[PDB]
């Protein structure tokens, strides 16, 4: 169809089959890309655990297209979980550069689980929780029914020992074990670098893990440059009854008896208290101004979370591909063939000097 460049080139970066608050292995990431056009090395050490490095093969425009993972559910079966933002934008890649995609993973859920008294809660035959929060209008002892946050996913690069951040895609809140929100949080996109990448607020419930920053609450969802695993349960629900519900890796944030917020550029906030009707909140995503938006963060991704990078090049005058781009004016040339630029007159295309 296109001359030039073909968009039918796309790779796509999973999970490798993962869940929950820890990254994809390296032999879980062969077996999914097993005869694909894609071939990654998994991090097994350092913030770069669980991370996929590709490289690009030569100086081409390729657009990313990542997709941040779904909260996980609450004590309240009938409660839907917050599904994971995506950020599609158009960026130049360079030869050589080593891209590092965290694909972000699907919260953890808290019912129904192996527990025999919480099956009970989680089935609705006990509601002792309820009986708490009707004597304390909060949870302080019987802790734990919220959702880990969903693990939002970081694709960027590394440039003269500074990771450079392309295509960040927040995930969606945890529900709470009281979760009682109709109404899922509008999807967050920042486009500025100089916007510090912190973590969400954390209370008892964990926040989302940002770009970078310290975690010192062990059930806050880790930042990126921390391996971004997510954070555990509150204390409480995991000393009472166990009750394990991590964020998705990615800066999956913990569940208490609030819902964990979501990862992110900027990590989602969690409940303050432990309110248990507190839903977590989303996660911040990110683009950078390197690349060209080619469509604002949208709410698509329903578990387990993703990247499809493939090869879109968007003219006004060809809209699939059949262009060249500019990357210093961030334009596209529709009538620039191979060792020519446009001419300084706003004229066609002439033989590059």
């Known amino acids: 169809q296109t001359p030039i460049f073909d968009p039918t080139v796309h790779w796509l ?78 960026f130049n890649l360079e030869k050589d550069d080593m ?51 969903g693990g939002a996913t970081y694709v960027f690069k590394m440039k003269d020992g500074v990771p450079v951040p392309l295509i960040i895609a927040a995930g969606g809140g945890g529900r709470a074990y009281g979760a009682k929100t109709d109404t899922f949080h509008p999807e967050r996109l920042e486009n500025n670098s100089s916007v510090l990448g912190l ?39 995991m000393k009472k009854w166990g009750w394990e519900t991590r964020g998705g890796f990615g800066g999956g944030g913990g569940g208490c008896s609030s819902g964990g917020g979501g990862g992110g550029y900027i990590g989602g906030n969690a409940a303050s208290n432990n309110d248990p009707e507190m839903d977590g909140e989303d996660g911040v995503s990110f683009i950078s101004p390197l690349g060209i938006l080619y469509t604002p963060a949208l709410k698509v991704m329903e578990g387990h979370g993703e990247v499809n990078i493939k090869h879109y090049l968007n003219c006004s005058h060809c809209e699939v591909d059949e262009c060249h781009m500019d990357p210093e004016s961030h334009k596209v040339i529709c009538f620039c063939d191979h060792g020519t630029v446009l001419a300084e007159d706003g004229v066609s295309c002439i033989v590059s000097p």
């Not at 090395?41 to 425009?61: N, R, Y």
């Not at 089935?123 to 302080?140: A, P």
């Open 99 to 149: 891209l590092y995609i965290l694909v972000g993973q699907q919260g953890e859920d808290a019912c129904p689980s192996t527990n025999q008294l919480i099956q009970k809660v989680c089935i609705g035959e006990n509601n002792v929780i309820e009986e708490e929060i009707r004597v304390n209008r909060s949870v302080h002892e019987w802790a734990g029914g919220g959702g880990g946050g």
């Open 199 to 237: 973590n969400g607020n954390s209370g008892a419930a964990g926040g989302g893990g940002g770009w970078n920053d310290n975690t010192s609450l062990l059930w806050a969802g880790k930042s990126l440059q921390e391996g971004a695993t997510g954070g555990h349960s509150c204390p409480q629900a």
């Open 13 to 90: 970066f999973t999970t490798c089959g993962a869940s929950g608050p820890h990254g994809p292995t390296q032999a879980q990431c062969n077996n999914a890309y097993q005869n694909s056009n894609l071939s990654v090395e998994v991090g097994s050490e350092g913030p770069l655990k669980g991370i996929q490095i590709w490289k690009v093969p030569a100086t081409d425009t390729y657009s990313i297209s990542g997709y941040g993972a779904a909260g996980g559910k609450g004590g309240k079966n009938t409660m839907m979980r917050s599904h994971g933002v995506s950020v599609l934008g158009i």
